[PDB]
Design an enzyme around this catalytic site. Structure first.
Site, PDB file in Angstrom:
ATOM      1  CG  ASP A   1      11.946  -2.406   2.416  1.00  0.00           C
ATOM      2  OD1 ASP A   1      12.458  -1.861   1.421  1.00  0.00           O
ATOM      3  OD2 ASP A   1      11.028  -3.224   2.316  1.00  0.00           O
TER       4      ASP A   1
ATOM      5  CG  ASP B   1       8.050  -2.369   7.291  1.00  0.00           C
ATOM      6  OD1 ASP B   1       7.548  -3.262   6.596  1.00  0.00           O
ATOM      7  OD2 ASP B   1       9.167  -2.529   7.831  1.00  0.00           O
TER       8      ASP B   1
ATOM      9  NE  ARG C   1       9.847  -1.175  -1.750  1.00  0.00           N
ATOM     10  CZ  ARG C   1      11.091  -0.868  -2.083  1.00  0.00           C
ATOM     11  NH1 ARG C   1      11.327  -0.068  -3.101  1.00  0.00           N
ATOM     12  NH2 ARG C   1      12.119  -1.302  -1.331  1.00  0.00           N
ATOM     13  CG  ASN C   2       7.943   0.360   2.408  1.00  0.00           C
ATOM     14  OD1 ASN C   2       6.894  -0.255   2.207  1.00  0.00           O
ATOM     15  ND2 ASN C   2       9.134  -0.187   2.255  1.00  0.00           N
TER      16      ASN C   2
HETATM   17  C1  LIG Z   1      -4.840   4.854   0.000  1.00  0.00           C
HETATM   18  N1  LIG Z   1      -4.339   4.589   1.338  1.00  0.00           N
HETATM   19  C2  LIG Z   1      -4.141   3.352   1.780  1.00  0.00           C
HETATM   20  O1  LIG Z   1      -4.300   2.362   1.082  1.00  0.00           O
HETATM   21  C3  LIG Z   1      -3.642   3.143   3.168  1.00  0.00           C
HETATM   22  C4  LIG Z   1      -3.211   1.867   3.510  1.00  0.00           C
HETATM   23  C5  LIG Z   1      -2.735   1.620   4.782  1.00  0.00           C
HETATM   24  O2  LIG Z   1      -2.310   0.340   5.091  1.00  0.00           O
HETATM   25  C6  LIG Z   1      -1.335   0.072   6.022  1.00  0.00           C
HETATM   26  C7  LIG Z   1      -0.181   0.851   6.151  1.00  0.00           C
HETATM   27  C8  LIG Z   1       0.791   0.533   7.112  1.00  0.00           C
HETATM   28  C9  LIG Z   1       0.613  -0.564   7.950  1.00  0.00           C
HETATM   29  N2  LIG Z   1       1.509  -0.939   8.923  1.00  0.00           N
HETATM   30  C10 LIG Z   1       2.757  -0.454   9.078  1.00  0.00           C
HETATM   31  O3  LIG Z   1       3.162   0.577   8.534  1.00  0.00           O
HETATM   32  N3  LIG Z   1       3.537  -1.179   9.895  1.00  0.00           N
HETATM   33  C11 LIG Z   1       4.723  -0.747  10.421  1.00  0.00           C
HETATM   34  C12 LIG Z   1       5.204   0.563  10.535  1.00  0.00           C
HETATM   35  C13 LIG Z   1       6.455   0.496  11.148  1.00  0.00           C
HETATM   36  C14 LIG Z   1       7.374   1.641  11.503  1.00  0.00           C
HETATM   37  C15 LIG Z   1       6.606   2.583  12.422  1.00  0.00           C
HETATM   38  C16 LIG Z   1       8.610   1.114  12.236  1.00  0.00           C
HETATM   39  C17 LIG Z   1       7.805   2.381  10.241  1.00  0.00           C
HETATM   40  N4  LIG Z   1       6.705  -0.800  11.408  1.00  0.00           N
HETATM   41  N5  LIG Z   1       5.657  -1.562  10.972  1.00  0.00           N
HETATM   42  C18 LIG Z   1       5.608  -2.900  11.081  1.00  0.00           C
HETATM   43  C19 LIG Z   1       6.051  -3.502  12.259  1.00  0.00           C
HETATM   44  C20 LIG Z   1       6.017  -4.892  12.390  1.00  0.00           C
HETATM   45  C21 LIG Z   1       5.541  -5.683  11.352  1.00  0.00           C
HETATM   46  N6  LIG Z   1       5.508  -7.034  11.495  1.00  0.00           N
HETATM   47  C22 LIG Z   1       5.052  -7.829  10.497  1.00  0.00           C
HETATM   48  C23 LIG Z   1       4.603  -7.271   9.303  1.00  0.00           C
HETATM   49  C24 LIG Z   1       4.635  -5.882   9.135  1.00  0.00           C
HETATM   50  C25 LIG Z   1       5.104  -5.085  10.173  1.00  0.00           C
HETATM   51  C26 LIG Z   1       5.140  -3.691  10.033  1.00  0.00           C
HETATM   52  C27 LIG Z   1      -0.545  -1.327   7.805  1.00  0.00           C
HETATM   53  F1  LIG Z   1      -0.751  -2.388   8.593  1.00  0.00           F
HETATM   54  C28 LIG Z   1      -1.508  -1.014   6.850  1.00  0.00           C
HETATM   55  C29 LIG Z   1      -2.715   2.664   5.704  1.00  0.00           C
HETATM   56  C30 LIG Z   1      -3.160   3.935   5.323  1.00  0.00           C
HETATM   57  N7  LIG Z   1      -3.598   4.161   4.068  1.00  0.00           N
END
Ligand SMILES: CNC(=O)c1cc(Oc2ccc(NC(=O)Nc3cc(C(C)(C)C)nn3-c3ccc4ncccc4c3)c(F)c2)ccn1
Length: 292
Positions: free
Chosen positions: A136, A154, A140-141
């Site tokens: 995905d 993500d 947006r991600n």
């Molecule tokens: C203004 N700024 C803000 O608002 C702001 C907001 C902010 O919130 C978040 C951003 C990202 C995440 N988490 C992720 O990115 N998860 C992720 C990454 C990957 C990769 C590494 C494989 C891409 N896999 N999975 C990931 C892996 C497994 C999962 N299983 C279930 C559900 C989701 C999943 C996601 C989070 F929890 C909170 C952070 C910083 N700033």
């Protein structure tokens, strides 16, 4: 995993919600330093522990079980998601007196836009080498972090677990043909999505295929239909996009080769994305109904 003390956390506002959990802005103390974090309150832990250290992948700062709940402290990205950031740069919309006065359509330069594209490519290279498939990839991600470094993230939509409310069919617009027609996801299909993301960057956050339905994509993409070159885009950048969307997955470039092309563009004196205003200028359209 790095373990965080509950008492080491001061929570602030909610910045995202979902059927499966919430995300809060917070301050944490880690090792000796006090720092920002986004804390997800409810796998994801293991993935972030493996990849997060890469500067173009959003990082895990720490985790914490308190009472019933698991808390993941995630690197805070002060500038938010890249799509909104791109759209906020549309200064002819958001600050017309500045835009007209400076004959400019964006507060972002050609080089900054290419640096974002290069950041995502760098991150995807590492992630794909580690045998992960994103599935995905889209602006947006992507998060715009400290020092305007782009971070791959993500938000859980692909797992039915979204935080912050996307229209369910919206990801179709980033899907490789083989994902659309055979539900195949590979590094090569992630490259296709990447091309669409590059198109998002160059168009300053246009909705891909604005004005077309998802159904029309299924019919037209296998006929060779592709996103048109933005008027503001050099042939070389559009050529790179078109490489990403070759029908044959095995003929698409790797993320390493994408990054090499972008760095070669970054290094030249020449300007690749035209951000100048002129008569009859128009932004690529946004269709909010396709998105929300
Ligand atoms: C203004 N700024 C803000 O608002 C702001 C907001 C902010 O919130 C978040 C951003 C990202 C995440 N988490 C992720 O990115 N998860 C992720 C990454 C990957 C990769 C590494 C494989 C891409 N896999 N999975 C990931 C892996 C497994 C999962 N299983 C279930 C559900 C989701 C999943 C996601 C989070 F929890 C909170 C952070 C910083 N700033």
């Amino acid at each position: 995993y790095p373990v965080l003390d509950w008492n080491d956390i001061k929570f602030q506002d909610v910045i995202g919600e979902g059927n499966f959990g919430q995300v809060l802005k917070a301050r944490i103390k880690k090792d000796g330093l006090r720092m920002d974090a986004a804390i997800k309150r409810m796998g994801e832990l293991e993935v972030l522990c493996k990849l997060g250290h890469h500067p173009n992948i959003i990082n895990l700062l720490g985790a914490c079980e308190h009472r019933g709940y698991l808390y993941l402290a995630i690197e805070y990205a002060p500038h938010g998601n890249l799509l909104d950031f791109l759209r906020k740069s549309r200064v002819l919309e958001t600050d017309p007196a500045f835009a007209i006065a400076n004959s400019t359509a964006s507060t972002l330069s050609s080089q900054q836009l290419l640096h974002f594209a290069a950041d995502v490519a760098r991150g995807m290279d590492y992630l794909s080498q580690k045998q992960f498939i994103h599935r995905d990839l889209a602006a947006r991600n992507i998060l715009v972090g400290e020092n305007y470094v782009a971070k791959i993230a993500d938000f859980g939509l692909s797992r039915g677990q979204e935080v912050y409310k996307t229209m369910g069919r919206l990801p179709v617009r980033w899907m490789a043909i083989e994902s659309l027609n055979y539900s195949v996801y590979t590094t090569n299909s992630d490259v296709w999505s990447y091309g669409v993301l590059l198109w998002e960057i160059v168009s300053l956050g246009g909705t891909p295929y604005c004005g077309m339905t998802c159904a029309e994509l299924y019919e037209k993409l296998p006929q060779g239909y592709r996103l048109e070159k933005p008027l503001n885009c050099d042939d070389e950048v559009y050529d790179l996009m078109r490489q990403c969307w070759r029908e044959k997955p095995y003929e698409r470039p790797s993320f390493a080769q994408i990054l090499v092309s972008l760095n070669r563009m970054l290094e030249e004196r020449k300007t690749y994305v035209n951000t100048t205003l002129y008569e009859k200028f128009t932004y690529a359209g946004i269709d909010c109904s396709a998105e929300e």
